[PDB]
Design a protein around this ligand. Structure first.
Ligand SMILES: CCNc1cc(C(=O)N[C@@H](Cc2ccccc2)[C@H](O)CNCc2cccc(C(F)(F)F)c2)cc(N2CCCCS2(=O)=O)c1
Ligand SMILES: CCNc1cc(C(=O)N[C@@H](Cc2ccccc2)[C@H](O)CNCc2cccc(C(F)(F)F)c2)cc(N2CCCCS2(=O)=O)c1
Length: 374
Protein backbone atom coordinates (compact mmCIF):
# COMPACT_ATOMS: atom_id res chain seq x y z
CA UNK A 1 0.00 0.00 0.00
CA UNK A 2 3.00 2.33 0.60
CA UNK A 3 4.75 1.50 -2.70
CA UNK A 4 4.65 4.37 -5.24
CA UNK A 5 3.29 6.77 -2.64
CA UNK A 6 5.71 9.53 -3.70
CA UNK A 7 5.39 11.95 -6.57
CA UNK A 8 7.31 14.98 -7.69
CA UNK A 9 8.73 17.12 -10.39
CA UNK A 10 12.48 17.08 -11.11
CA UNK A 11 14.41 19.76 -9.12
CA UNK A 12 11.30 20.46 -7.05
CA UNK A 13 11.35 17.71 -4.37
CA UNK A 14 9.37 14.51 -3.75
CA UNK A 15 6.08 14.62 -1.86
CA UNK A 16 3.66 12.31 -0.08
CA UNK A 17 -0.05 12.77 0.49
CA UNK A 18 -0.95 13.73 4.05
CA UNK A 19 -3.91 15.03 6.04
CA UNK A 20 -3.89 17.62 8.82
CA UNK A 21 -6.67 18.51 11.24
CA UNK A 22 -10.02 17.02 12.03
CA UNK A 23 -11.97 16.78 9.74
CA UNK A 24 -8.92 15.92 7.62
CA UNK A 25 -7.57 18.52 5.20
CA UNK A 26 -5.56 16.87 2.40
CA UNK A 27 -2.17 18.36 1.57
CA UNK A 28 0.86 17.19 -0.42
CA UNK A 29 4.00 17.33 1.74
CA UNK A 30 7.66 17.38 0.56
CA UNK A 31 9.70 14.60 2.21
CA UNK A 32 12.80 16.22 3.72
CA UNK A 33 15.54 14.22 5.50
CA UNK A 34 17.55 17.51 5.67
CA UNK A 35 15.45 19.34 8.30
CA UNK A 36 13.21 18.62 11.29
CA UNK A 37 10.18 20.91 11.15
CA UNK A 38 6.78 19.80 9.90
CA UNK A 39 5.36 22.96 8.28
CA UNK A 40 2.40 23.65 6.00
CA UNK A 41 1.16 26.65 4.03
CA UNK A 42 -1.52 28.13 6.26
CA UNK A 43 -2.43 31.31 4.35
CA UNK A 44 -3.00 32.20 0.66
CA UNK A 45 0.11 32.36 -1.56
CA UNK A 46 0.45 32.84 -5.37
CA UNK A 47 1.86 29.28 -5.75
CA UNK A 48 -0.46 27.46 -3.31
CA UNK A 49 -3.55 25.72 -4.72
CA UNK A 50 -4.61 24.87 -1.15
CA UNK A 51 -3.56 25.53 2.46
CA UNK A 52 -4.23 24.50 6.07
CA UNK A 53 -7.22 26.32 7.58
CA UNK A 54 -6.79 26.16 11.34
CA UNK A 55 -10.27 27.52 12.12
CA UNK A 56 -11.87 24.46 10.41
CA UNK A 57 -10.05 21.97 12.63
CA UNK A 58 -11.76 20.96 15.89
CA UNK A 59 -8.54 19.38 17.16
CA UNK A 60 -6.18 22.30 16.50
CA UNK A 61 -4.29 23.75 19.51
CA UNK A 62 -2.36 27.04 19.20
CA UNK A 63 1.04 26.91 20.96
CA UNK A 64 1.26 30.75 21.08
CA UNK A 65 4.79 30.85 19.70
CA UNK A 66 6.16 31.92 16.34
CA UNK A 67 8.86 30.17 14.35
CA UNK A 68 11.24 31.07 11.50
CA UNK A 69 13.19 28.63 9.29
CA UNK A 70 15.78 29.73 6.69
CA UNK A 71 16.90 26.84 4.45
CA UNK A 72 19.72 26.90 1.86
CA UNK A 73 16.95 27.84 -0.56
CA UNK A 74 13.83 29.59 0.73
CA UNK A 75 12.61 30.68 4.13
CA UNK A 76 9.32 30.87 5.99
CA UNK A 77 7.75 32.10 9.17
CA UNK A 78 4.65 30.90 10.92
CA UNK A 79 2.83 30.04 14.10
CA UNK A 80 3.36 26.87 16.11
CA UNK A 81 0.42 24.66 17.05
CA UNK A 82 -0.46 20.95 17.31
CA UNK A 83 -3.07 18.89 15.40
CA UNK A 84 -3.83 15.41 14.13
CA UNK A 85 -1.76 14.31 11.13
CA UNK A 86 -2.21 11.20 8.97
CA UNK A 87 -0.58 9.59 5.94
CA UNK A 88 -3.42 8.01 3.81
CA UNK A 89 -0.97 5.87 1.75
CA UNK A 90 1.38 5.25 4.66
CA UNK A 91 0.89 3.33 7.88
CA UNK A 92 -2.77 3.39 8.89
CA UNK A 93 -1.76 5.67 11.71
CA UNK A 94 -2.71 9.12 12.80
CA UNK A 95 -0.74 11.06 15.39
CA UNK A 96 -1.00 14.38 17.19
CA UNK A 97 2.04 16.34 16.04
CA UNK A 98 3.63 19.79 16.09
CA UNK A 99 2.76 21.86 13.01
CA UNK A 100 4.21 25.16 11.88
CA UNK A 101 1.44 27.08 10.15
CA UNK A 102 3.30 29.11 7.49
CA UNK A 103 1.90 32.64 7.14
CA UNK A 104 4.83 34.37 5.37
CA UNK A 105 7.44 32.96 2.98
CA UNK A 106 10.25 34.00 0.60
CA UNK A 107 11.34 31.79 -2.36
CA UNK A 108 10.11 28.70 -0.53
CA UNK A 109 6.98 27.60 -2.40
CA UNK A 110 7.66 26.62 -6.03
CA UNK A 111 5.35 27.43 -8.95
CA UNK A 112 3.77 24.13 -10.20
CA UNK A 113 5.45 21.80 -7.67
CA UNK A 114 2.13 20.36 -6.39
CA UNK A 115 3.19 20.45 -2.71
CA UNK A 116 1.95 22.76 0.07
CA UNK A 117 4.21 21.89 2.98
CA UNK A 118 7.30 20.07 4.19
CA UNK A 119 7.98 17.07 6.46
CA UNK A 120 11.34 17.37 8.19
CA UNK A 121 12.44 13.82 9.01
CA UNK A 122 15.76 14.64 10.76
CA UNK A 123 16.36 14.92 14.52
CA UNK A 124 15.22 17.36 17.22
CA UNK A 125 18.70 18.87 17.53
CA UNK A 126 18.05 21.01 14.39
CA UNK A 127 14.33 21.80 14.91
CA UNK A 128 13.42 25.47 15.22
CA UNK A 129 12.92 27.35 17.48
CA UNK A 130 14.78 24.73 19.57
CA UNK A 131 15.11 20.97 20.23
CA UNK A 132 12.07 20.86 22.57
CA UNK A 133 9.85 20.96 19.47
CA UNK A 134 9.39 17.24 18.89
CA UNK A 135 9.70 16.29 15.18
CA UNK A 136 6.94 14.36 13.43
CA UNK A 137 8.69 10.99 13.18
CA UNK A 138 9.51 11.02 16.90
CA UNK A 139 5.81 11.66 17.66
CA UNK A 140 4.84 8.85 15.28
CA UNK A 141 7.15 6.31 16.97
CA UNK A 142 6.11 7.35 20.51
CA UNK A 143 2.35 7.31 19.83
CA UNK A 144 2.09 4.22 17.62
CA UNK A 145 3.87 0.85 17.54
CA UNK A 146 5.82 1.81 14.38
CA UNK A 147 9.42 0.52 14.32
CA UNK A 148 11.93 3.35 14.48
CA UNK A 149 13.03 3.28 10.81
CA UNK A 150 11.92 4.53 7.40
CA UNK A 151 13.19 4.07 3.87
CA UNK A 152 13.13 6.17 0.70
CA UNK A 153 13.23 4.99 -2.89
CA UNK A 154 13.41 8.16 -5.01
CA UNK A 155 13.03 7.53 -8.74
CA UNK A 156 14.02 9.76 -11.68
CA UNK A 157 9.13 16.20 -15.54
CA UNK A 158 7.10 13.94 -13.22
CA UNK A 159 9.02 11.61 -10.90
CA UNK A 160 7.85 9.10 -8.32
CA UNK A 161 8.98 6.49 -5.81
CA UNK A 162 8.16 5.21 -2.36
CA UNK A 163 8.48 6.01 1.32
CA UNK A 164 8.22 2.89 3.54
CA UNK A 165 7.60 3.73 7.18
CA UNK A 166 8.53 1.26 9.90
CA UNK A 167 10.19 -1.26 7.64
CA UNK A 168 12.30 -2.32 4.67
CA UNK A 169 10.59 -3.41 1.45
CA UNK A 170 12.75 -6.08 -0.18
CA UNK A 171 10.90 -5.74 -3.49
CA UNK A 172 12.34 -2.23 -3.87
CA UNK A 173 16.03 -3.25 -4.07
CA UNK A 174 18.48 -5.85 -5.33
CA UNK A 175 21.83 -7.02 -3.92
CA UNK A 176 23.08 -6.21 -0.41
CA UNK A 177 22.24 -3.32 1.90
CA UNK A 178 25.47 -1.64 3.03
CA UNK A 179 25.37 0.47 6.22
CA UNK A 180 27.16 3.67 7.19
CA UNK A 181 26.96 5.01 10.79
CA UNK A 182 24.93 8.10 11.61
CA UNK A 183 27.82 10.06 13.12
CA UNK A 184 25.69 12.46 15.15
CA UNK A 185 21.89 12.58 15.48
CA UNK A 186 21.04 16.06 14.18
CA UNK A 187 21.02 16.01 10.43
CA UNK A 188 21.55 12.48 9.09
CA UNK A 189 25.30 13.05 9.31
CA UNK A 190 27.63 10.55 7.65
CA UNK A 191 31.33 10.31 6.74
CA UNK A 192 32.81 10.19 3.22
CA UNK A 193 36.25 8.57 3.23
CA UNK A 194 37.21 8.64 -0.46
CA UNK A 195 35.94 10.18 -3.72
CA UNK A 196 36.84 8.85 -7.17
CA UNK A 197 35.99 10.32 -10.56
CA UNK A 198 36.43 8.26 -13.74
CA UNK A 199 38.18 5.73 -11.47
CA UNK A 200 40.80 8.24 -10.29
CA UNK A 201 41.18 9.14 -6.62
CA UNK A 202 40.69 12.86 -5.95
CA UNK A 203 43.63 12.44 -3.50
CA UNK A 204 42.63 14.84 -0.76
CA UNK A 205 42.89 14.45 2.96
CA UNK A 206 39.53 12.75 3.60
CA UNK A 207 38.57 15.40 6.17
CA UNK A 208 38.12 17.81 3.23
CA UNK A 209 35.14 15.74 2.04
CA UNK A 210 33.38 16.32 5.35
CA UNK A 211 34.20 19.95 6.00
CA UNK A 212 32.26 20.83 8.06
CA UNK A 213 29.78 17.93 7.89
CA UNK A 214 28.30 15.57 5.29
CA UNK A 215 24.58 14.82 5.27
CA UNK A 216 21.96 12.76 3.42
CA UNK A 217 19.26 15.26 2.36
CA UNK A 218 16.21 14.30 0.23
CA UNK A 219 15.09 17.97 0.40
CA UNK A 220 18.13 19.30 -1.47
CA UNK A 221 18.35 18.67 -5.24
CA UNK A 222 22.09 18.58 -5.89
CA UNK A 223 25.25 16.93 -4.76
CA UNK A 224 26.70 19.88 -2.83
CA UNK A 225 30.45 19.91 -2.18
CA UNK A 226 32.87 22.01 -0.04
CA UNK A 227 34.64 24.57 -2.29
CA UNK A 228 38.00 22.72 -2.49
CA UNK A 229 36.27 19.40 -3.29
CA UNK A 230 33.91 21.09 -5.79
CA UNK A 231 36.81 22.67 -7.68
CA UNK A 232 38.75 19.37 -7.86
CA UNK A 233 35.62 17.48 -8.95
CA UNK A 234 34.81 19.97 -11.73
CA UNK A 235 38.44 19.77 -12.96
CA UNK A 236 38.25 15.94 -13.09
CA UNK A 237 34.81 15.87 -14.79
CA UNK A 238 36.00 18.47 -17.34
CA UNK A 239 39.10 16.39 -18.11
CA UNK A 240 37.12 13.16 -18.53
CA UNK A 241 34.58 14.91 -20.81
CA UNK A 242 37.17 16.98 -22.71
CA UNK A 243 36.06 15.66 -26.11
CA UNK A 244 33.37 18.36 -25.83
CA UNK A 245 33.76 21.86 -24.35
CA UNK A 246 30.97 23.52 -22.41
CA UNK A 247 30.62 27.16 -21.30
CA UNK A 248 31.87 28.08 -17.83
CA UNK A 249 28.25 28.88 -16.91
CA UNK A 250 27.20 25.24 -17.32
CA UNK A 251 29.64 24.15 -14.59
CA UNK A 252 28.26 26.85 -12.26
CA UNK A 253 24.67 25.72 -12.93
CA UNK A 254 23.89 29.07 -14.61
CA UNK A 255 23.20 27.47 -17.95
CA UNK A 256 21.77 24.38 -19.64
CA UNK A 257 23.59 21.93 -21.89
CA UNK A 258 21.46 20.65 -24.76
CA UNK A 259 21.72 17.93 -27.38
CA UNK A 260 19.42 16.79 -30.15
CA UNK A 261 16.74 14.49 -28.67
CA UNK A 262 18.00 10.99 -27.89
CA UNK A 263 21.66 11.79 -28.62
CA UNK A 264 23.03 12.77 -25.20
CA UNK A 265 26.65 11.48 -25.19
CA UNK A 266 26.49 9.77 -21.77
CA UNK A 267 29.72 7.84 -22.35
CA UNK A 268 31.88 11.02 -22.36
CA UNK A 269 30.84 11.80 -18.74
CA UNK A 270 32.52 9.94 -15.90
CA UNK A 271 31.15 7.83 -13.09
CA UNK A 272 31.57 9.31 -9.54
CA UNK A 273 32.21 7.00 -6.58
CA UNK A 274 31.53 8.20 -3.02
CA UNK A 275 33.06 5.88 -0.42
CA UNK A 276 31.11 5.96 2.86
CA UNK A 277 32.50 4.90 6.22
CA UNK A 278 31.60 1.32 7.15
CA UNK A 279 30.47 -0.14 10.46
CA UNK A 280 33.99 -1.57 11.03
CA UNK A 281 37.31 0.30 11.43
CA UNK A 282 38.97 1.44 8.18
CA UNK A 283 36.32 -0.37 6.13
CA UNK A 284 34.09 1.38 3.60
CA UNK A 285 31.68 0.77 0.74
CA UNK A 286 31.14 2.89 -2.39
CA UNK A 287 28.04 4.17 -4.08
CA UNK A 288 28.60 4.87 -7.78
CA UNK A 289 26.79 7.71 -9.51
CA UNK A 290 26.22 7.95 -13.30
CA UNK A 291 25.91 11.13 -15.35
CA UNK A 292 22.18 10.23 -15.76
CA UNK A 293 22.03 11.34 -12.08
CA UNK A 294 24.23 14.44 -11.95
CA UNK A 295 23.05 15.90 -15.26
CA UNK A 296 19.50 16.69 -14.18
CA UNK A 297 17.01 16.83 -17.09
CA UNK A 298 15.13 20.13 -17.41
CA UNK A 299 11.73 19.62 -19.05
CA UNK A 300 10.54 22.46 -21.26
CA UNK A 301 8.27 22.02 -24.27
CA UNK A 302 9.99 25.02 -25.97
CA UNK A 303 13.41 23.22 -25.96
CA UNK A 304 11.90 19.82 -26.79
CA UNK A 305 13.59 19.24 -30.15
CA UNK A 306 16.47 18.72 -27.64
CA UNK A 307 17.24 16.97 -24.36
CA UNK A 308 18.53 19.71 -21.96
CA UNK A 309 20.26 19.28 -18.57
CA UNK A 310 21.49 21.30 -15.58
CA UNK A 311 24.72 20.30 -13.85
CA UNK A 312 23.40 19.01 -10.49
CA UNK A 313 26.73 19.41 -8.59
CA UNK A 314 27.28 22.72 -6.79
CA UNK A 315 29.48 24.48 -4.25
CA UNK A 316 28.67 24.64 -0.55
CA UNK A 317 30.16 26.55 2.38
CA UNK A 318 28.22 24.35 4.81
CA UNK A 319 29.68 20.96 3.96
CA UNK A 320 28.66 18.08 1.73
CA UNK A 321 25.05 17.43 0.85
CA UNK A 322 24.12 14.08 -0.76
CA UNK A 323 20.83 15.38 -2.22
CA UNK A 324 18.03 13.84 -4.30
CA UNK A 325 20.08 13.30 -7.49
CA UNK A 326 22.46 11.12 -5.43
CA UNK A 327 19.67 9.26 -3.63
CA UNK A 328 17.72 8.57 -6.84
CA UNK A 329 18.09 4.95 -7.99
CA UNK A 330 19.24 3.86 -4.52
CA UNK A 331 17.09 2.37 -1.82
CA UNK A 332 18.09 4.32 1.24
CA UNK A 333 17.22 3.02 4.72
CA UNK A 334 17.16 5.53 7.58
CA UNK A 335 17.69 3.03 10.42
CA UNK A 336 17.24 5.38 13.37
CA UNK A 337 16.90 2.39 15.77
CA UNK A 338 20.49 1.28 14.98
CA UNK A 339 21.88 4.77 14.20
CA UNK A 340 22.82 3.79 10.66
CA UNK A 341 21.99 4.54 7.01
CA UNK A 342 21.71 1.63 4.53
CA UNK A 343 22.22 1.89 0.77
CA UNK A 344 21.27 -0.58 -1.95
CA UNK A 345 20.67 -0.51 -5.68
CA UNK A 346 16.95 0.20 -6.14
CA UNK A 347 14.35 -1.32 -8.40
CA UNK A 348 14.43 2.00 -10.31
CA UNK A 349 18.23 2.33 -10.45
CA UNK A 350 19.82 4.25 -13.28
CA UNK A 351 21.72 2.37 -15.96
CA UNK A 352 22.33 2.16 -19.68
CA UNK A 353 23.74 -0.72 -21.77
CA UNK A 354 27.31 0.01 -20.61
CA UNK A 355 27.16 1.13 -16.98
CA UNK A 356 24.94 1.05 -13.90
CA UNK A 357 24.64 2.70 -10.48
CA UNK A 358 26.17 0.40 -7.88
CA UNK A 359 26.66 -0.16 -4.15
CA UNK A 360 29.79 -2.22 -3.55
CA UNK A 361 32.13 -3.28 -0.75
CA UNK A 362 33.94 -3.87 1.39
CA UNK A 363 36.95 -1.63 0.84
CA UNK A 364 39.96 -1.35 3.11
CA UNK A 365 42.48 1.40 3.76
CA UNK A 366 45.67 1.24 5.86
CA UNK A 367 45.44 5.00 6.57
CA UNK A 368 44.57 5.41 10.28
CA UNK A 369 43.03 8.91 9.88
CA UNK A 370 39.57 9.83 11.19
CA UNK A 371 37.73 11.47 8.29
CA UNK A 372 35.34 13.42 10.52
CA UNK A 373 36.06 17.10 10.46
CA UNK A 374 35.49 17.95 14.12
C1 LIG B 1 13.81 20.90 -3.80
C2 LIG B 1 14.08 22.37 -4.00
N1 LIG B 1 15.41 22.64 -4.45
C3 LIG B 1 16.48 22.94 -3.51
C4 LIG B 1 16.23 22.96 -2.08
C5 LIG B 1 17.31 23.30 -1.21
C6 LIG B 1 17.09 23.32 0.29
O1 LIG B 1 17.46 24.24 0.97
N2 LIG B 1 16.22 22.28 0.79
C7 LIG B 1 15.71 22.34 2.17
C8 LIG B 1 14.21 21.99 2.10
C9 LIG B 1 13.48 22.76 0.96
C10 LIG B 1 12.61 21.99 0.08
C11 LIG B 1 11.93 22.71 -0.98
C12 LIG B 1 12.11 24.13 -1.14
C13 LIG B 1 12.98 24.90 -0.27
C14 LIG B 1 13.65 24.20 0.80
C15 LIG B 1 16.47 21.29 3.02
O2 LIG B 1 15.86 21.22 4.33
C16 LIG B 1 17.91 21.81 3.27
N3 LIG B 1 18.58 20.87 4.22
C17 LIG B 1 19.80 21.47 4.79
C18 LIG B 1 19.45 22.69 5.69
C19 LIG B 1 20.09 23.96 5.41
C20 LIG B 1 19.81 25.12 6.23
C21 LIG B 1 18.87 25.02 7.32
C22 LIG B 1 18.23 23.75 7.57
C23 LIG B 1 17.25 23.65 8.72
F1 LIG B 1 17.70 22.70 9.55
F2 LIG B 1 16.03 23.30 8.26
F3 LIG B 1 17.18 24.82 9.41
C24 LIG B 1 18.51 22.59 6.77
C25 LIG B 1 18.61 23.58 -1.71
C26 LIG B 1 18.85 23.51 -3.14
N4 LIG B 1 20.20 23.85 -3.52
C27 LIG B 1 20.60 25.27 -3.37
C28 LIG B 1 20.24 26.08 -4.67
C29 LIG B 1 20.96 25.55 -5.98
C30 LIG B 1 20.55 24.07 -6.29
S1 LIG B 1 20.84 23.10 -4.73
O3 LIG B 1 20.27 21.77 -4.89
O4 LIG B 1 22.27 23.04 -4.52
C31 LIG B 1 17.81 23.23 -4.04
C1 LIG C 1 -2.92 11.82 20.87
C2 LIG C 1 -3.93 10.96 20.18
N1 LIG C 1 -4.99 11.71 19.64
C3 LIG C 1 -6.18 11.03 19.13
C4 LIG C 1 -6.19 9.61 18.99
C5 LIG C 1 -7.37 8.98 18.51
C6 LIG C 1 -7.41 7.47 18.34
O1 LIG C 1 -8.31 6.83 18.74
N2 LIG C 1 -6.36 6.92 17.50
C7 LIG C 1 -6.45 5.54 17.06
C8 LIG C 1 -6.39 5.47 15.51
C9 LIG C 1 -7.42 6.43 14.87
C10 LIG C 1 -7.12 7.13 13.66
C11 LIG C 1 -8.09 8.00 13.08
C12 LIG C 1 -9.36 8.19 13.70
C13 LIG C 1 -9.67 7.48 14.90
C14 LIG C 1 -8.71 6.60 15.48
C15 LIG C 1 -5.27 4.77 17.65
O2 LIG C 1 -5.35 3.45 17.16
C16 LIG C 1 -5.29 4.80 19.20
N3 LIG C 1 -4.03 4.20 19.69
C17 LIG C 1 -4.04 4.03 21.14
C18 LIG C 1 -3.97 5.40 21.82
C19 LIG C 1 -5.17 6.07 22.26
C20 LIG C 1 -5.09 7.35 22.90
C21 LIG C 1 -3.82 8.00 23.09
C22 LIG C 1 -2.63 7.34 22.64
C23 LIG C 1 -1.24 7.98 22.85
F1 LIG C 1 -0.29 7.28 22.21
F2 LIG C 1 -1.01 7.96 24.17
F3 LIG C 1 -1.16 9.25 22.47
C24 LIG C 1 -2.71 6.04 22.02
C25 LIG C 1 -8.50 9.76 18.15
C26 LIG C 1 -8.47 11.19 18.31
N4 LIG C 1 -9.63 11.94 17.95
C27 LIG C 1 -10.19 11.80 16.59
C28 LIG C 1 -10.84 13.15 16.15
C29 LIG C 1 -12.10 13.49 17.02
C30 LIG C 1 -11.91 13.43 18.54
S1 LIG C 1 -10.64 12.18 19.06
O3 LIG C 1 -10.00 12.69 20.23
O4 LIG C 1 -11.19 10.93 19.37
C31 LIG C 1 -7.33 11.82 18.78
Amino acid sequence: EMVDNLRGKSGQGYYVEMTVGSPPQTLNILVDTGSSNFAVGAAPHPFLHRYYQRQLSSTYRDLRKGVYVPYTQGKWEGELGTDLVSIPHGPQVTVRANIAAITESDKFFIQGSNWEGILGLAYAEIARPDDSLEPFFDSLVKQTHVPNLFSLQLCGASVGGSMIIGGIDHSLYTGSLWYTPIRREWYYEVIIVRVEINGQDLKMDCKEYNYDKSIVDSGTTNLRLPKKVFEAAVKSIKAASSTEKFPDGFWLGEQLVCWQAGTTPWNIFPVISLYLMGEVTQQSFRITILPQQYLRPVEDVATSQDDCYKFAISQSSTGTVMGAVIMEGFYVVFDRARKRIGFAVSACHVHDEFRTAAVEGPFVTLDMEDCGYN
